[PDB]
Amino acid sequence: YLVSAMLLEIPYMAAHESDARRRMISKQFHHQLRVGERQPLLGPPESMREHVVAASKAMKMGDWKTCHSFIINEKMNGKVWDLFPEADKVRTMLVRKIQEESLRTYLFTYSSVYDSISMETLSDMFELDLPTVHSIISKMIINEELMASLDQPTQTVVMHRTEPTAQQNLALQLAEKLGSLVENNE
Amino acid sequence: YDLTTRIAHFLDRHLVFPLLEFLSVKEIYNEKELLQGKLDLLSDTNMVDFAMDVYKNLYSDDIPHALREKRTTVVAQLKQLQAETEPIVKMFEDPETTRQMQSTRDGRMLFDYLADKHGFRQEYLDTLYRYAKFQYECGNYSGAAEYLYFFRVLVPATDRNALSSLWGKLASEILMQNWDAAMEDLTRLKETIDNNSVSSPLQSLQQRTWLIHWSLFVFFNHPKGRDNIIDLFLYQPQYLNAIQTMCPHILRYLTTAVITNKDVRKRRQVLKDLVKVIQQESYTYKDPITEFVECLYVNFDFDGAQKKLRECESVLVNDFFLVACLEDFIENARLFIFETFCRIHQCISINMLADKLNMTPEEAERWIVNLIRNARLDAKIDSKLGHVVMGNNAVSPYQQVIEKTKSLSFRSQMLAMNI
Amino acid sequence: QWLWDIIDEFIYQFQSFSQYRCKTAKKSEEEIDFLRSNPKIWNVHSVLNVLHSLVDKSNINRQLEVYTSGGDPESVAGEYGRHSLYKMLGYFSLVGLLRLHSLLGDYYQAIKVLENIELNKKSMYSRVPECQVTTYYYVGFAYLMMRRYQDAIRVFANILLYIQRTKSMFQRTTYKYEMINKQNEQMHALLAIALTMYPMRIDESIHLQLREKYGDKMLRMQKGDPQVYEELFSYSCPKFLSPVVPNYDSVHPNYHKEPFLQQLKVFSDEVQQQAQLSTIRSFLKLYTTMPVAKLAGFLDLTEQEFRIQLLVFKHKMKNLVWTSGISALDGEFQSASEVDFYIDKDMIHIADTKVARRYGDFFIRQIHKFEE
Numbered sequence A: 001y002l003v004s005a006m007l008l009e010i011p012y013m014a015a016h017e018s019d020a021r022r023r024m025i026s027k028q029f030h031h032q033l034r035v036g037e038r039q040p041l042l043g044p045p046e047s048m049r050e051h052v053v054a055a056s057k058a059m060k061m062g063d064w065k066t067c068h069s070f071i072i073n074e075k076m077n078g079k080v081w082d083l084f085p086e087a088d089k090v091r092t093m094l095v096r097k098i099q100e101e102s103l104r105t106y107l108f109t110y111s112s113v114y115d116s117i118s119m120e121t122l123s124d125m126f127e128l129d130l131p132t133v134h135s136i137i138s139k140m141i142i143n144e145e146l147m148a149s150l151d152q153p154t155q156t157v158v159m160h161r162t163e164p165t166a167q168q169n170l171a172l173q174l175a176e177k178l179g180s181l182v183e184n185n186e
Numbered sequence B: 001y002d003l004t005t006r007i008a009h010f011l012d013r014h015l016v017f018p019l020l021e022f023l024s025v026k027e028i029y030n031e032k033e034l035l036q037g038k039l040d041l042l043s044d045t046n047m048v049d050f051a052m053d054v055y056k057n058l059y060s061d062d063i064p065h066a067l068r069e070k071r072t073t074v075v076a077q078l079k080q081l082q083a084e085t086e087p088i089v090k091m092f093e094d095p096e097t098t099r100q101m102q103s104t105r106d107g108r109m110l111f112d113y114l115a116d117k118h119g120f121r122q123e124y125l126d127t128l129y130r131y132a133k134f135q136y137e138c139g140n141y142s143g144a145a146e147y148l149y150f151f152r153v154l155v156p157a158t159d160r161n162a163l164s165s166l167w168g169k170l171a172s173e174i175l176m177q178n179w180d181a182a183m184e185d186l187t188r189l190k191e192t193i194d195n196n197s198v199s200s201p202l203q204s205l206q207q208r209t210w211l212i213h214w215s216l217f218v219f220f221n222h223p224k225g226r227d228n229i230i231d232l233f234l235y236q237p238q239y240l241n242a243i244q245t246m247c248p249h250i251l252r253y254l255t256t257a258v259i260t261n262k263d264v265r266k267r268r269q270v271l272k273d274l275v276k277v278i279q280q281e282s283y284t285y286k287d288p289i290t291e292f293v294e295c296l297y298v299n300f301d302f303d304g305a306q307k308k309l310r311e312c313e314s315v316l317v318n319d320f321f322l323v324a325c326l327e328d329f330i331e332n333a334r335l336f337i338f339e340t341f342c343r344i345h346q347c348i349s350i351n352m353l354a355d356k357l358n359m360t361p362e363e364a365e366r367w368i369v370n371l372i373r374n375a376r377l378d379a380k381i382d383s384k385l386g387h388v389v390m391g392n393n394a395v396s397p398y399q400q401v402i403e404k405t406k407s408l409s410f411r412s413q414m415l416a417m418n419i
Numbered sequence C: 001q002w003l004w005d006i007i008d009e010f011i012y013q014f015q016s017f018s019q020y021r022c023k024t025a026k027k028s029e030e031e032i033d034f035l036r037s038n039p040k041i042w043n044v045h046s047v048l049n050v051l052h053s054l055v056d057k058s059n060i061n062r063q064l065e066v067y068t069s070g071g072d073p074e075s076v077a078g079e080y081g082r083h084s085l086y087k088m089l090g091y092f093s094l095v096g097l098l099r100l101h102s103l104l105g106d107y108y109q110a111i112k113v114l115e116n117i118e119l120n121k122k123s124m125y126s127r128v129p130e131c132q133v134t135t136y137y138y139v140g141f142a143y144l145m146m147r148r149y150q151d152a153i154r155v156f157a158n159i160l161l162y163i164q165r166t167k168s169m170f171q172r173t174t175y176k177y178e179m180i181n182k183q184n185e186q187m188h189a190l191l192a193i194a195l196t197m198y199p200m201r202i203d204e205s206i207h208l209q210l211r212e213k214y215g216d217k218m219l220r221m222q223k224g225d226p227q228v229y230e231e232l233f234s235y236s237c238p239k240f241l242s243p244v245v246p247n248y249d250s251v252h253p254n255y256h257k258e259p260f261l262q263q264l265k266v267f268s269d270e271v272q273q274q275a276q277l278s279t280i281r282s283f284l285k286l287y288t289t290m291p292v293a294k295l296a297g298f299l300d301l302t303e304q305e306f307r308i309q310l311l312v313f314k315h316k317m318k319n320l321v322w323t324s325g326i327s328a329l330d331g332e333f334q335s336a337s338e339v340d341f342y343i344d345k346d347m348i349h350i351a352d353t354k355v356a357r358r359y360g361d362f363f364i365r366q367i368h369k370f371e372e
Helices: A059-063 A084-094 A116-121 A125-137 A162-166 A178-185 B004-010 B031-042 B051-055 B075-082 B094-109 B121-138 B142-148 B160-175 B180-195 B201-216 B222-230 B250-261 B268-275 B279-286 B289-295 B304-316 B327-342 B350-357 B361-372 B399-412 C004-023 C031-037 C044-064 C073-086 C096-109 C116-121 C129-145 C149-161 C178-193 C208-223 C226-234 C237-241 C257-281 C292-303 C309-317 C349-360 C363-371
Strands: C289-291 C324-327 C332-335
Touching: A059 A084, A116 A125, A178 B399, B004 B201, B031 B201, B094 B121, B121 B142, B121 B160, B142 B160, B160 B180, B160 B201, B180 B201, B201 B222, B222 B250, B250 B268, B250 B289, B250 B327, B279 B289, B289 B304, B304 B327, B304 B350, B327 B361, B350 B361, B361 C292, B399 C349, C004 C044, C004 C073, C044 C073, C044 C096, C073 C096, C096 C116, C096 C129, C116 C129, C129 C149, C129 C178, C149 C178, C178 C208, C178 C226, C178 C237, C208 C226, C208 C257, C226 C257, C237 C257, C289 C292, C292 C309
Parallel strands: none
Antiparallel strands: C289 C332, C324 C332
């Protein structure tokens, strides 16, 4: 959920040739291919209904359903560290939900705020000034920076330009195939 | 690793000639003390690299430095005690044992040129044994060792004497501060390190720290001598599994050669599997200063990077060794944090940059100019205001695939039109 | 032996076939009509005019490599063997144009190239792509020596990509295709460095693999590395006045070296000034209307110390590639910044690719109806 529903919600908008073929989709095709769901009861849906909001980031909504009724059902009690594994989890919920609007909701976002982003989700400014810096180099995102002002101008334009590149998801898988045709021929 | 199996039963149980100590409690720059103290453990009888450990600070305890190395340097050891008025009169051993040798060594140095001018393999084999004995006894007498391991090098007991006398000779030449005859012996270490030996982990870690010792005290173009000091022994960063690896200035000379003398396109080799994972990360815990050089630097940090990299450089200059790999490494810690930034970003007010980097906006103008002519910082300059824009983003990348579809198929189905 | 006796036999056969084509290609239209009618294959009698011509071009200078001073072969070739085929009535096929190409082969070997205006004027025959390749090959060298590289760069890209649609299929070249391909490569690589960053003419002919190789060379040459110019001259110096190949590299005879010196001494003095101009103009026009401060800042890069900075910059500005001016009142260096655009490299390919569909159904629908 933190190495798949985050690492791979970047290339899932029409760039499929990095899909790791052993993940939650073991079970994510199951507890989604059901005609009825509500407030989850099992482990996996109670490990999903905060994941589904970890797509609509909601730092509030996702942190509030790994600590709902698990401290009886072995999350907090059992992991023999009384409260701290949540202080770990909460942090990897707080932080891994600032790395989301960055990767998902950036379309009309040109001028954005990175002081108020610290006020929204309550992580340390340096522990947000690090990953907001990481967001550019580590994930090669189309967004510019002058971080004496603590800002990230985007100038992304890819939206109906990645559609003709979503034609190159397959226009490559035409002319990437002619590379493989005459390997067999001779 | 493979040999970490054999390490599992040793775990730092080496046996070289120098045994015990390095000049105890100093005050400040506290990481430098043990990182050279542990080289002195496996290196050899250093000798003004001791008085380099002196000048650092003040206390007194220069006493047991080389006074327990007597067979060579007899007077300078008996000197150093009365240099500080220390009555340890029990030093009257070498006036006997050195005087005892004369009549023997006299016969041997007149069997020397019955072996040289003749060119006799067996009259030489005689003189060989007798001097091979003397060389391990005291071959400093490194002028005599330079005479010895220049001709037929081989020793009668072809292993341990050609090990220790040649190893002690490499060291001894350095203790007199001779380099070119230390550099032929350098290649005669390149011999025994790769031959190799019985080659147990006690000899593996020995011989890996061994060839990195002369790389510590830089004399030659060790900028070039880096590729030689790195590409040996399943080329690890530290050379050893032995997580207590203490020749760990490796990264300063790897980064010297490839950033300062080469350039780091080409950072792939220097950083990725040479820095992050285990051995260098064990050293990233050890050392306070040259932690930050790859801790903020892997975090891809922008200005607070250049802050800690500047405070790094200000005591990088305190690389108080036979140094010769300094301002290259200093100005190129500034150079690479510059080029990592100048790869990607939007723009900068170079008045701010200059304030952040501790120069003036005039230098900042001339400095972006000299990087545009370098063609590494790929952008054009605004004249005065100091807003040299950095605006590279791809547009319509179909050109590759467009002509690519007919770069192969359009001229490879013309293959079919000749039948 | 095994070389000179065969050379003499070949030369005699070429002078014989030069006389045969000199006689019956002015008044007579009887042997021509016989050759159109009876032998159905149009190949062989058009092949002869290139097959013999290329080995004659070879054998002429091969003999001249010995007979350097007071040369027979070039006078026997040009005046008697080539001009006799050139100045005549045009054979109404691919012979008339190939006779002009056979003369232009030696007219280029000799560095006396000025009749490029006449050779193309009197070539009013249908420019069949087979002859068009050799046209833009030979005429290209005239534009290269015309020191107008912005116009000359366009010519060599046509012959180097070979999208001209030459399909023979009867060994017409002949036996030397990779030599002409490498020669066009080296001439294109020469034209690339002389103008960069103006072209933006080096994507089509040779694509991104050798483009990046010659691109790294091109950057080194402009930044001041003379090794690239040395390589560029060394690989091209034979390619100017090589027949096809010399006779035999020997030590005893001093004759064979004298033409090789004539080849070296000519095309060095021309390209050395071009290599200097490449470094003079190397630096990109970053800024237009420069003030006195970083005018002197860019005078440093042009040439400093000290004496003669201003006059040297003036000399470097007067090279037909630096349009600028000095405003002495305001102290304002008002310079040009000539840049171009890319995207329309996808304009002649859309038609090529429509004919690439036709190409896809040329051979295969030939097979189809040879298969039914």
